[PDB]
Nucleic acid binder design. Structure first.
Ligand code: SF4
Ligand SMILES: [Mn+2]
Lengths: 343, 218, 98, 342, 98, 342, 343, 190
DNA sequence: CGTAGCTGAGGACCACCAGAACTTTTTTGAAT
DNA sequence: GTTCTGGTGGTCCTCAGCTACGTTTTTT
């Protein structure tokens, strides 16, 4: 369907894939929908319960193309590949850089600058939209502080110091996080961070959302051969996806916090879906969880543009290609990893 | 360690460390898990008892199950099986109801009482966690064992608390070191579920040098 | 390991949910072993898989209305089974080439 | 300590694989060839245009069931690889050791020790129980040559020079391997190496045996949790299952070659088994394929005792257990990785 | 050795000799044993009685149309047999005080 | 070498028995109560009012399945006896042996030898386990006397004399038997081995044991193809199937009395289960009888060895083999019938 | 039904024997059919696939009344008895007499006297009703020969002499029996006598009828308490019921041979239903055997009067009664055993 | 004039080739071309009866005439005896016995014999000579001597005794025993 | 009463047909 | 391409019911 950087994508379920001559062909119960070339492609990524054609796999593997089958929601199912496997030098270089400080700090500072870049224009955009009920001067002052820390972190090379500006920026964003609420302030309030046993309502939402993101971005690295358990800014620890968390930082704001804001402001969910715990903790409800997942699926289908390339893409494909870029950063002619500088 | 809450260890690792030092290493370093008859039956018991979102009260008391509880002194988080709240004007008022109630933690296991501490350790540590949430002190603990279908009482003493603190610090050090120890074999590992992994048969025997040199020479 | 185990079941479809119970039991028991005659299955399992299957079934059927029996023939199952009719069963330890 | 589950080999073309519950079902245009329980399988080897629905691939990947595709004569058409587990420390340590030359050189020392010992043991067993029909004196002379070379190779510290000695030892061993024509006529005589084309007999069987051994070594190395694409031996050519070949090296001396030789002397196959098209190299038949697979699976159930472990286990469990002995050494448990000295 | 054996039949009722063969096999096996489930009989016999039953029962059934399986457990059958449902059986080592 | 088979005690009154194929079916006014195969059922014992179809009687009788009808509290009535299965030579030799005092006194000698030996050694063993509850010395003295009896029992040739000696064997043991009991001396009012056919408590159990043993022994003798209840050695005075009693004289002292004594000592039943009629007779309640029968059968199932060669057999085979040996005596195999001796 | 000797011979099938007071009642399916006292009865013998009241059998078992159950055809099934009554003395006396020889010779000569009397009277009758086409003066000469046989047997005293003088009359019987055949004489003949593989059809019919009568007499001997495998005339042999053959040699006249003669006459059978296979044996067909058994049953159902007792009865009871008198001889209630005699 | 009593069955000739006591256990104690079949055959000089299983009458010029048909036929005997060919000649005795019975029926001599092997499905050919017939005559007269005396013999148990179905009645162990005298003195001592 | 021969009347039981769908934390869990 | 759910239909399976009868030359 859509080709981008020598890779083929398929998004619509129930669409068979076959080979005709030297070209790939999309089918849908004996209906021909498209035909695309294969001469210059590198890999095929599918999200349908298709199965493809065995001749297609044989030919592509004989020509050093790796096919990757996933599900219609974004899990990882299988990787059919010949002897190349796709990534060998890529993974070995990733692990070699994972023990070196300067390049890891470069990638880190790219993460910080991109995400807080995006965050501060989000603050500016929400201030522009709603001047009546928002004390915009405080947000403006925080915006100038954010720009100052932008300029200051643009020339930093120490990991612990970067963690420090992460701490201060996160505290500031927390102190401004309270005020983008505009409706049902009676019980939906934000008063800090509780990753473990969630407390005070909305917190729980964020945590769950974050988890989903990790899985999604994990699959992204799985498509490119990058390891999803060895982080650069985060440290490697068993049972935790360090690199997935590292890459999730930019997508945290728009794709999680803006999502929960769009959920709450439209009265999609209320206090009836949140159950209480005797120690004060807050729990989730089966119908509430299913409605949350349905709204998440609805939001995943939105079609937006890509700032760095301009090609139209859906949200569900954004984390993948970006990780691809990171892969192309490890082995490629790209000078620096391009962050998701989105306005 | 985003906010120091990411460095939280499991309660379930304490029992594994206490029985087979490498078993805890296997479960919480290399992320391995193999199941036998006893652990399958125990898991079935746990999921049968894992039925949240309902409360039964008999006029005075109430029960709560599957509590996500954490303690910052040891920085250990986990989930408790059951705690019973009794009606008495001695404890601190708890959110969700009215009046003053006292807490008593009870957990369910499937097996005979063990000569060592093992199981009771968990409740000991469990007690600490609760005293960090409700701001109170607990000196009484409850157990039920299903193999004999029998209720066993345990007091709470400071020597046990100190031992738990010591092992918590030691296992934090082991986790930071990423070190798998070696422990005595004994008849322990015949229901040690991960037996085909931590290969205790190879520890007590001779090293690689002499065997290969002898077989190479003759 | 891998002892042979034979499972038989007779559920009551005259009850309120008899048809549902029979379908669920058939599908649950099929996941582990073969079928040789209606209402009987032969499977090759170890103690772990047998335990899992036993709990699954006893949670699946109800008492007071249905019956279920289980037999284990040990490690030498090859020289204890004899067949006469015309309903062969494909063994799972032969080279298994299709 | 495992069960050595069975294996499935599909030969009929245009066969389709579906998943129902936990059972694998073979179809051919809505006509079902059968269904099997998946709690008894380890590997599925498809032949020809074998289409597998994605759900089956994912289910077999998440439970460590290897699926391989071969077209007609056991080439490297494809494999199947799944997602990751929590074995971060193991892979980290493996990469760190691979980065350093010295530990890799000791590993190569041990591998070539396995080479020399297993080769000398097999050739001396061949010489011992056999009368003047075999060249006893030259075989013994090659035995002393290898026994001389083994001490020197035991203390090597470079990869290129060690590659030199292993190559020359392979040539020396082939110089005596060129003689095994005891109970077979001259049409099955070994006449050098042919990498791509199975031009003559025997070598056509050799290619299939090599593929069948490699596709099991790769499965075992995926089972242990290790990553098998950064080799401790050979030049690290990107895009190859490096450690698969790395580990199957020591197995190559007894696992497939001895089986083929025993088959040839036992005359289990006949010259009519292989047919030839206009050039076609040398091709095997459906009967030949069936006989080879049946004999392979029958031999895989043989029972031996492991020398180092001193325990009784099925012979087909050499490649897993052997690979397992590597993983513990990656945690510093032993001082070096033990070879195979059967 | 007076061991336990289990016999399961399955006879087609559709053919020309369906009903008669079914009735005759059921009545010719109920003599030697007991009904624990439909089409599943179990009995306690020695070698000679079982051989006679096999030779007598291989002629009532018709091959290429029916199936018949015989499973022998052993003299220690008390440990390899389980009943979980609600159709209880009667053993033949009970003193049998009716 | 034979295999012991079950029995079948029908306790429900107003019942009925029937044949169907090779199965016995228990009927009660046209609602069945059970069906049992007839190839593992070595006897049938009826209680109260029971019937049987003539086909069942014929089939059982000609296939060695003894029927027996009892009333209410184990009163014997109407055994079922079938045909004569041949073996004329053994029967003729047995009948010839009778009416002659020499051989009759020889066999009586062996029989009484067995009885006295069993009584002596049972008493000696009892005082050997627990001496604190009993007076050892008296027991010892009795043994001495019994030993002397042996010689006299062997040194006699007139049936009248041995019978007289029987009385002495009664008078030396009966008085002792009172102190056999160790518990419930007040609950189980016991007046010695004194017996009353109307029963006086702690005689109902003893009578029941005697009846069951008599039925079993009669069946065992009629299975082998001869008759020894009105035979050669015992008295001819009619109405007394008591040579069977004379063949079980070596058993009634051990097999029945020892069983009753163990039952008393182990507190297996209590005086709550007994009661007394207005006329002075005593009866056992139904639960007591069921418990007694269960104990009897469970005791029968246990396995022991034999004095001859050590071959294993259960309790229930002790009577039958004792029958068989007798026939083997009359075919010239053994010099004289070797009795049962512990 | 009740014979004068104290035994019941209930022969109507499908009859229930119940106890009323101290009396036996015969019920034919819920109707009170018959009543009889029990004051002096010695034994009860019941025919037919039937039953007995449990109370009745329990009551009778006390007062030395053995109840014998035989099926309606004549096979002997069971004997319900308490302690055995009136059997041990009979058996021991039988064995003692068998060991002896003089009393056995007396019994054998009595049997032979009965046989020759039956034969002579049958010959006299036959020459009486049909003195038309037959050798008549030869039959009178045979009658006088049978009278001298009378005299020699009644004053005979040796076993070998008794056997020889028995054999002497057998051949005269053989020729006169061949002369007996009047109707259908053309195709059926008695040119010879064959026992082993009976040649000629008449020999096979003789063997068949002899087998039936032997089985019936064996049941008769067993139902009273006497062993059948030890004999008085014939000697000991395993598997052979010698006393049964003695009663055969007595009764093989009126009841056995007349049946075959009447079957041959009256055109009740043709040679088509008879076979001939390579040696002279006649393999009876199914229909012929069915008709033979039907005729045997019908003749068993015939009504006659016993010559000695004078009481009306059937033919089927004739064997049993005879055996009973033999028992009454050994128990001492009678001085002799007349099968068919004046005395 | 009763010649039937002195005649026995032919099968009893087999059991004096194996477990001599078994014959007394069964027969005394009483406890358990043309292809003609089931021939009742008796012989007077050796005084034995039985049933020949199969007789093949084959036409030839130099044969023996049969009763009822003119010409000359041979009467080769065929018996179905399963098992493996065995050294202890347990099956050739009944073949030679029935052959010589048939020959005594006609007073002539033949030297041919067929036998069936069911488990191997084999045809086996056997000639006969004087050394077999003399042994048969001696064995038959010795059998008559045993039968007329009602005597049960004693034989060595052997390894085969775990195969005779009468092992619960044959009682093999009562061959080499210490006798009741040792029991008497043992009970005297103890 | 027991042994066969046929009905008939409900239960068990497996293969199809059509239709609507297809997403979820992190924590406990054995040892004769 | 899979899971689950109703719903259908034709094949195994046993019990209740009514009619109609019951015997054979003596081989392991
Ligand atoms: S098994 Fe031995 S004792 Fe029994 S019949 Fe055969 S030879 Fe005789
Ligand atoms: Mn617990």
């Amino acid at each position: 369907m859509k080709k981008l950087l020598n890779t083929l994508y398929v998004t619509q379920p129930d669409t068979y894939l076959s080979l005709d001559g030297d070209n790939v062909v999309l089918l849908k119960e004996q209906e021909k929908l498209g035909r695309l070339p294969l001469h210059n492609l590198e890999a095929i990524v599918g999200f349908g319960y298709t199965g493809a054609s065995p001749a297609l796999m044989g030919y592509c593997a004989e020509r050093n193309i790796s096919i990757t089958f996933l599900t219609k929601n974004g899990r990882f199912l299988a990787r059919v590949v010949g002897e190349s496997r796709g990534n060998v030098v890529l993974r070995k270089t990733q692990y070699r850089i994972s023990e070196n400080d300067q390049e890891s700090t470069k990638i880190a500072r790219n993460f910080i600058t991109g995400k807080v870049y995006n965050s501060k224009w989000m603050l500016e955009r929400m201030t522009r939209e709603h001047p009546l009920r928002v004390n915009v001067e405080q947000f403006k002052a925080t915006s100038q502080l954010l720009s100052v820390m932008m300029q200051e972190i643009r020339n930093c090379d120490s990991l612990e110091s970067l963690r420090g500006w992460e701490g201060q920026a996160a505290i500031n964003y927390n102190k401004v996080f309270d005020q983008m609420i505009l409706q049902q302030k009676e019980e939906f309030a934000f008063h800090g961070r509780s990753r473990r046993p969630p407390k005070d309502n909305v917190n729980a939402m964020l945590s769950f959302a974050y988890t989903l993101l990790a899985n999604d971005v994990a699959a992204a690295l799985e498509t490119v051969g990058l390891d999803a358990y060895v982080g650069f800014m985060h440290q490697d620890r068993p049972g935790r996806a360090s690199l997935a968390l590292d890459l999730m930082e930019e997508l945290r704001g728009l794709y999680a916090d803006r999502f929960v804001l769009s959920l709450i402001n439209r009265k999609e969910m209320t206090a009836d879906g949140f159950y209480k715990k005797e120690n004060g903790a807050v729990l989730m409800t089966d119908e509430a969880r299913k409605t949350f997942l349905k709204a998440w699926q609805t939001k995943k289908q939105e079609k937006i543009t890509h700032p760095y390339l301009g090609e139209k893409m859906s949200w569900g494909l954004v984390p993948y290609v970006q990780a691809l870029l990171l892969a192309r950063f490890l082995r490629g002619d790209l000078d620096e990893y391009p962050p998701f500088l989105w306005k | 360690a985003s906010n120091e809450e990411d460095r939280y260890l499991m309660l379930s690792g304490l029992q594994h460390f206490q029985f087979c030092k490498r078993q805890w290493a296997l479960i919480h370093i290399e992320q391995q898990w193999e199941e036998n008859v006893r652990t399958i039956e125990g898991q079935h018991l746990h999921k049968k008892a894992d039925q949240p979102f309902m409360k039964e009260k008999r006029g005075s008391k109430l029960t709560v199950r599957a509590m996500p509880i954490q303690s910052k002194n040891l920085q250990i988080s986990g989930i408790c099986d059951v705690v019973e709240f009794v009606q008495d004007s001695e404890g601190i008022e708890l959110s969700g109801v009215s009046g003053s109630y006292k807490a008593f933690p009870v957990e369910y296991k499937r097996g005979k009482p063990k000569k060592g501490d093992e199981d009771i350790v968990q409740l000991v540590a469990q007690a600490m966690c609760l005293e960090e949430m409700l701001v109170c002190r607990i000196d009484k603990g409850y157990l039920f064992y299903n193999e004999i279908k029998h209720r066993v009482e345990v007091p709470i003493t400071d020597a046990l608390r100190d031992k738990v603190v010591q092992m918590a610090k030691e296992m934090h050090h082991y986790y930071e070191n990423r070190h798998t120890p070696k422990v005595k074999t004994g008849p322990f590992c015949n229901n040690c579920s991960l037996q085909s992994i931590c290969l205790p048969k190879l520890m007590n025997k001779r090293s690689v040098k002499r065997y290969i040199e002898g077989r190479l020479s003759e | 390991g891998s002892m042979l185990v034979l499972i038989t079941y007779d559920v009551q479809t005259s009850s309120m949910g008899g048809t549902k119970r029979l379908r669920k039991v058939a599908k649950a028991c099929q996941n582990y072993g073969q079928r040789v005659q209606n209402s009987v299955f032969e499977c090759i399992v170890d103690s772990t898989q047998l335990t899992s299957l036993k709990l699954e079934l006893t949670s699946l059927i109800d008492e007071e209305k249905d019956s279920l029996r289980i037999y284990r023939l040990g490690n030498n199952y090859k020289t204890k089974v004899e067949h006469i009719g015309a309903k062969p069963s494909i063994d799972l330890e032969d080279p298994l080439i299709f």
